[PDB]
Amino acid sequence: EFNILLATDSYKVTHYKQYPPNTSKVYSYFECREKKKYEETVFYGLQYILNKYLKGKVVTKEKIQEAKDVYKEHFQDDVFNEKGWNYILEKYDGHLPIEIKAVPEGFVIPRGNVLFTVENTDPECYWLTNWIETILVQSWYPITVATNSREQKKILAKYLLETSGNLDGLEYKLHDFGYRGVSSQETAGIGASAHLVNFKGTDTVAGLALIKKYYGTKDPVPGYSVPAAEHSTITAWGKDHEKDAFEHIVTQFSSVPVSVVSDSYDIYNACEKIWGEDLRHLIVSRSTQAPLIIRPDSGNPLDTVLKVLEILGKKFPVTENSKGYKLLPPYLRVIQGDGVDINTLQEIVEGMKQKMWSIENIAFGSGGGLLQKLTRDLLNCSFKCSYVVTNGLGINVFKDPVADPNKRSKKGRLSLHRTPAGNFVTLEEGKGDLEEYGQDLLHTVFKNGKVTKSYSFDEIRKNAQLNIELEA
Amino acid sequence: EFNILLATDSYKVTHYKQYPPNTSKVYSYFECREVKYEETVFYGLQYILNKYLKGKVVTKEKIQEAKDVYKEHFQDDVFNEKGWNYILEKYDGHLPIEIKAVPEGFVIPRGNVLFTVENTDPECYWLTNWIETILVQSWYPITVATNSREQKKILAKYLLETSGNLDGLEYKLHDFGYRGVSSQETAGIGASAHLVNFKGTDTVAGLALIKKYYGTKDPVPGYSVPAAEHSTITAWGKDHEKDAFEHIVTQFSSVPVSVVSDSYDIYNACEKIWGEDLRHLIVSRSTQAPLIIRPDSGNPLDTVLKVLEILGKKFPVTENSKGYKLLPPYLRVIQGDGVDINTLQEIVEGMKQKMWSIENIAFGSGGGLLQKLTRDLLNCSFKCSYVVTNGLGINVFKDPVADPNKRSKKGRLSLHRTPAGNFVTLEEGKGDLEEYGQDLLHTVFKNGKVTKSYSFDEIRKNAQLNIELEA
Ligand SMILES: O=C(NCc1ccc(S(=O)(=O)c2ccccc2)cc1)c1cnc2n[nH]cc2c1
Ligand SMILES: O=C(NCc1ccc(S(=O)(=O)c2ccccc2)cc1)c1cnc2n[nH]cc2c1
């Protein structure tokens, strides 16, 4: 069983001895700090943390004893606020005396804004606010996944709209291939959920159960997939029988979409001779609802996509859509599932546009780039104390390191507001209380061990919509 | 509860329908194919076997749940309920799979077989690659352990050069990554991988992982000491940084204590607060209880060098037997910002150029140590090499025209010692020729049971540096 007393950075175990004496309140906040191409961030993932780790009876006498035993050895010393944790167990039946206020999940907010705040609701527990920094700060991950994935949707939407005149199929244009390429099962479920904020295609099955249990959708499931080959299911036929494997596979899955990896030996041969001649009669007969999706998986991503499109365009009948771009027949599409990240995604669609290929021809699969190749530095996700009450006097506190202004933190009690032009501003020094802006956009989501305000996955998807989708 | 029927890539649910008819065996292997990372530490498969693969992993409830989920996920019924029922009925839900693997902690050059997977029942030919996804997650502990060991090699080189010994090495790179990884589970796994090489960690989650899955003779495998954060300094108010420092070092007067010193002005803090106002409370400390000053901002090399220069003018520096400058034993520095393998190398080299011993410094690394890593670094990859269809074995492989680096190995594999004492991977069942002695892989899982396992102490021993072996 998870133990909250063992889920912090070692050194925070020692912080209750370090705050000013006579401190009754420690108030802290999280922001994606501005760095003076990710100017706004999707806030998503805190509700998972709240429910899985923070709510309810999270302190027991056994958990207190276990932590005591581990820390004695880990520090070779007895430092460990047993009394403080006992107090929570005795007075509040092990529920955390904490209040967290947060912008609504799905909200899209420019950098350098307060996204959530954390404070203790009992003076005895001034040390508890920053105890839970470590676990709360892991929110960086679903925020960053959701944000990076939304930025890739923006690129796709722009190029799809330019080359086709509409957004049809956008929500299936970046599929999650990341299950194997992330660091753990738990990471899998959280990352795949964050991607589904923006798209509907996933092979990372772990995300589905996460969303059902912590967020929920009207629909049975949040994300979808279709049958597809891997190198094993082709190479197992023998080097001389790739055509046999292709023929068997597309015939097995004759009435649904099916994607077939085509680069086991020579992708260009497979497209031109195997699909484009030997097995062509099995492809041209397919339903628009059941295309063959050819998948290259090696070579320079851009050069390979362009050469595969050139090959297919000569073996299959291509049309020119109303915007002037070339379009494969509806029973044939391509997915590039190797080497995709936000930078290469952009290079490919721009490359396709230069060569007059519509983005309606293509979809992308991304694994490590989507779910693993991200860090807390990308959006400068950071948690800092801004306000403390000592001797009954509040003071506004901050860091401001001389050699890096970008690390200066905000001061005092914070609130998030709509500006007169309809943007966002964070008010410092308790200035929200002056009521010169509308209401504070942070809402209490957790208080004294109970989750107080929750969002469905459907609402979150609504909140994270692109401006061009809204315009449609 | 974890469900192995729901822990694979979606498309693998459909693979049972795509292998050649009459296939009875699918045999697959994992390798790290191909800043140089020429050799990898194999670590973390044992966690996965125990936590996810062993024992009764299939129930009637788990089958029905998978069934229900895939029906919606595919908008169709493609799930192999019959195949999964066969496991439940025939084997009480234990996986009929055999996995052979090199010993954990082993340090093996790139491009060698590390583990192999095959079904032990012909009906379960499809199961070998169902569990690709979960097994390939081993890339993460391997890669963390490996990059952490590469950093240890750098620190050893320079500590040996500037001090004449390796005293302190195992505490020179501390894990600060708990908040910077993608999840709790990731925290425990990657912290454990770093502890293969070092003993300093703040990522508490690794301690219970190691105790449950590997074990150590010692009560715990990793340690920490008291330290401030910005909140415990800034809470005193901007004009009271001195007061905060004094309170903290007096609270922790007889154990090591680290104090972040750049909340406002790191160079002021070192020269005037520590070096003048509070100097009398630092020069009185025990060798066993130093103050460890922590910068946390600015250019990491420039800041370390200026911090050491400031301190060397306020405190009595000696010159050790190698000609390098050393702080008094009650004073040390830790650089815990911007540290990855590249900046770690830049800092130690810049210290060496300025005649500072590496004894003076320790490093903390978070995102750089535990999160800034992918499966592409070591090219961790799982592929089928051998299948039996209609009773005939065939050697199979991929060989993409545009990328020879992605070519995979062929046939039944085994791992051998060469006449010169190195590793070689034999393909095509050639290990059976008996020209290169015994297979170095061991059966670690068979039919639901873990059959061979390693303590964390053995793993640490296997993972030692050659410089460490030398004296
Ligand atoms: O093909 C794979 N999964 C199946 C798959 C996934 C996505 C598509 S798609 O073209 O985006 C598509 C998605 C939804 C509906 C129609 C078409 C088609 C097939 C696949 C392929 N390679 C992978 N490596 N790692 C995980 C992987 C998953
Ligand atoms: O200082 C921190 N942790 C305590 C700590 C860690 C490491 C050392 S050390 O100087 O390497 C040391 C380790 C072991 C024994 C003696 C000295 C001293 C203190 C710390 C500081 N910043 C952090 N950010 N994220 C996690 C963090 C942890």
Swiss-Prot record, chain B:
EC top class, as a word: transferase
| Sites bearing Phosphotyrosine, chain numbering | 171
Q: Which GO terms describe its biological process?
A: cell-cell signaling; circadian regulation of gene expression; inflammatory response; NAD biosynthetic process; positive regulation of canonical NF-kappaB signal transduction; positive regulation of cell population proliferation; positive regulation of ERK1 and ERK2 cascade; positive regulation of gene expression
The entry marks the following residues as binding beta-nicotinamide D-ribonucleotide, namely 202, 294-296, 336-337, 367, 375
**Pathway(s) the chain acts in:** Cofactor biosynthesis; NAD(+) biosynthesis; nicotinamide D-ribonucleotide from 5-phospho-alpha-D-ribose 1-diphosphate and nicotinamide: step 1/1
Identify the GO cellular component terms for this protein.
cell junction; cytosol; extracellular exosome; nuclear speck
Q: What is the effect of changing residue 202 to N/S?
A: No effect on activity towards nicotinamide. Alters specificity, so that the enzyme acquires activity towards nicotinic acid
Expression by tissue, per the entry, reads: Expressed in large amounts in bone marrow, liver tissue, and muscle. Also present in heart, placenta, lung, and kidney tissues.
Keywords, sorted A to Z: Acetylation, Biological rhythms, Cytokine, Cytoplasm, Glycosyltransferase, Nucleus, Phosphoprotein, Pyridine nucleotide biosynthesis, Secreted, Transferase
Q: Which SUPFAM superfamilies match?
A: Nicotinate/Quinolinate PRTase C-terminal domain-like
MF terms from GO for this chain are: cytokine activity; identical protein binding; nicotinamide phosphoribosyltransferase activity
Swapping residue 230 to A leads to an effect described as:
Reduces activity towards nicotinamide
Catalytic activity from the UniProt record:
beta-nicotinamide D-ribonucleotide + diphosphate = 5-phospho-alpha-D-ribose 1-diphosphate + nicotinamide + H(+)
Checking Pfam families in the record gives: NAMPT_N (PF18127), NAPRTase (PF04095)
Keyword Secreted in the entry? The reply is yes
**Positions of post-translational Phosphoserine modification:** 455
E.C. code: 2.4.2.12
InterPro entries from the UniProt entry: Aldolase_TIM (IPR013785), DUF5598 (IPR041529), N/Namide_PRibTrfase (IPR041525), Nicotinamide_PRibTrfase (IPR016471), Nicotinate_pribotase-like_C (IPR036068)
Role noted for this protein = Catalyzes the condensation of nicotinamide with 5-phosphoribosyl-1-pyrophosphate to yield nicotinamide mononucleotide, an intermediate in the biosynthesis of NAD. It is the rate limiting component in the mammalian NAD biosynthesis pathway. The secreted form behaves both as a cytokine with immunomodulating properties and an adipokine with anti-diabetic properties, it has no enzymatic activity, partly because of lack of activation by ATP, which has a low level in extracellular space and plasma. Plays a role in the modulation of circadian clock function.
* Quaternary structure, from the entry: Homodimer.
Protein name in UniProt: Nicotinamide phosphoribosyltransferase
**What organism is listed for this UniProt entry?**
Homo sapiens (Human)
